[PDB]
Amino acid sequence: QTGGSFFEPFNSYNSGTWEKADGYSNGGVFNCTWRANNVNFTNDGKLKLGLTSSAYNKFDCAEYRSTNIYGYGLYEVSMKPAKNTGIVSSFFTYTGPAHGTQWDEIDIEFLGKDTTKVQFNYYTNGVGGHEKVISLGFDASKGFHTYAFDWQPGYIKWYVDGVLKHTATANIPSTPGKIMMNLWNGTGVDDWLGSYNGANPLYAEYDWVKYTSN
Numbered sequence: 001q002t003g004g005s006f007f008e009p010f011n012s013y014n015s016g017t018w019e020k021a022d023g024y025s026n027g028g029v030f031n032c033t034w035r036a037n038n039v040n041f042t043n044d045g046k047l048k049l050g051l052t053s054s055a056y057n058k059f060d061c062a063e064y065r066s067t068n069i070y071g072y073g074l075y076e077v078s079m080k081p082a083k084n085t086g087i088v089s090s091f092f093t094y095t096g097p098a099h100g101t102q103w104d105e106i107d108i109e110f111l112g113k114d115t116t117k118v119q120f121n122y123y124t125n126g127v128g129g130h131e132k133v134i135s136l137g138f139d140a141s142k143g144f145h146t147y148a149f150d151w152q153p154g155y156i157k158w159y160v161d162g163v164l165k166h167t168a169t170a171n172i173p174s175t176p177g178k179i180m181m182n183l184w185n186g187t188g189v190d191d192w193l194g195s196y197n198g199a200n201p202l203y204a205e206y207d208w209v210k211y212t213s214n
């Protein structure tokens with residue numbers, strides 16, 4: 001039912017293990033439309049997500065996700081988020097209504113307004129409110145760093161370059177979800193993300209993702 005351990009180096013588009021969001025907007029606070037053309041693979045082997053504009057105040061963003069669902073285990077990413085007011089660069093697990101389940105999600109999010117910090121959160125049956133902002137001690141937009149979360153039945157443990165930065169024990173998610181990565185500009189969450197100034201193009205880079213099942 002759920003996928004097994006894998007290593008993803010982003011050398012090319014593998015249309016059997018991953019897919020590109022295309023032609024729709026998540027709406028709400030998401031003020032951009034997902035475009036497959038904004039999901040690119042560099043020559044030096046990176047997944048590079050772009051936030052673009054081709055029309056007056058009309059933003060094109062990007063998301064990449066697995067075709068498989070995954071359960072408990074260690075999730076690791078090597079990435080460099082975009083730095084700009086009003087955006088988010090992330091790594092997260094997601095399952096929800098549209099997949100015929102409750103909304104269960106675990107996140108690693110970079111608020112563009114300040115890439116010196118990272119935000120950790122999780123949703124269980126759509127109940128969030130577990131935000132934890134960590135000062136990284138470096139500017140994540142400057143180099144690649146390894147971010148990870150160890151998802152187990154009774155806990156969630158988040159790591160930065162192999163160092164434990166946060167542990168959560170309350171109302172932990174349990175529904176297996178897809179692995180996702182995206183870059184987007186917000187609307188009406190100025191408080192949280194800063195307002196978006198329309199700066200384009202903007203890019204988030206990913207060197208690899210690794211999943212280790214129990």
Ligand code: NA
Pocket residue numbers: 009010011044045046047206207208
């Ligand atoms: Na890579």
